[model samples]
Target: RPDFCLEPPYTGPCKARIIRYFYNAKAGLCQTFVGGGCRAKRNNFKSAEDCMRTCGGA
Candidate 1:
């Protein structure tokens, strides 16, 4: 898996509850989380498919 994929989703400082996706290295799957609009990182994805494509079936 990619290094970033192992990291948890970043829910930075913001008053938003936007749905975001993150790759769970321990579970070996993409999970959903509420992301902030202010900040995000490589672990954040627009969709589960995108997450899987970027860090799945290695």
Candidate 2:
């Protein structure tokens, strides 16, 4: 006889893609907040916290 074990199923690729996009957006927001100067000063937040508050916690 053989013994078997069960494990949780893997999440689909679509969900992973969404999560990746969300992180990317957050990183962009954080970089801009830290004064990366990637573009115009559209984000008017004074600090990272402020930026997160304005940009969906990104």
Candidate 3:
């Protein structure tokens, strides 16, 4: 299974961090280097805690 997954409409702050980790950590390097398939948005997160919850997954 995937180490992480996201569902919309994403409502959290860490969403950007999560995506960054995915792209940088998981995918290996930033999406800017890869040039596709990355959704890093601040507005996507409803709250900072919510982002933590979603990324943490319990």
Candidate 4:
């Protein structure tokens, strides 16, 4: 649906589906994190498959 995050691997619902973003530890404002298996420090997601897409966050 158009309300989706359009972040790929997102063929599911918002509540059931996972989300991901990133963060900058040092000199890296890229600060991107995805999935929620670990501690990415953002809205977070559910799987590494979706987590590895940005900022090497897998």
Best by lDDT: 1
Q: How close is candidate 3 to the true structure, as a TM-score?
A: 0.24
What overall lDDT goes with each candidate model?
A: 0.78, 0.29, 0.32, 0.34
Worst 10 residues of 2 by lDDT: 1-10
Report the poorest 10 consecutive residues by lDDT, candidate 4. 1-10
The full ranking of all candidates by lDDT, starting with the best, is: 1, 4, 3, 2
- The model with the greatest TM-score is 1
What is the lDDT, from 0 to 100, of the residue 48 in candidate 3?
Answer: 40
Q: lDDT tens digits, residues 1-58, model 4?
A: 1212323322223342234443232332233332333443332434444433443432
Question: CA shift at 58, candidate 3, in angstroms?
Answer: 11
Q: Which 10-residue window of candidate 1 scores lowest in summed lDDT? A: 33-42
Q: Tell me the tens digit of each residue's lDDT in model 3 across 1-58.
A: 1243332232333323333222223323222211112444432333445445444432
lDDT of 2 by residue, 1-58 (tens): 0010011111232322221111124234433222222222343333556444545433
User: Which candidate would rank higher by lDDT, 2 or 4?
Assistant: 4
lDDT by residue (tens digit), candidate 1, 1-58: 6788877786787578778888888898988887545566678888889989998753
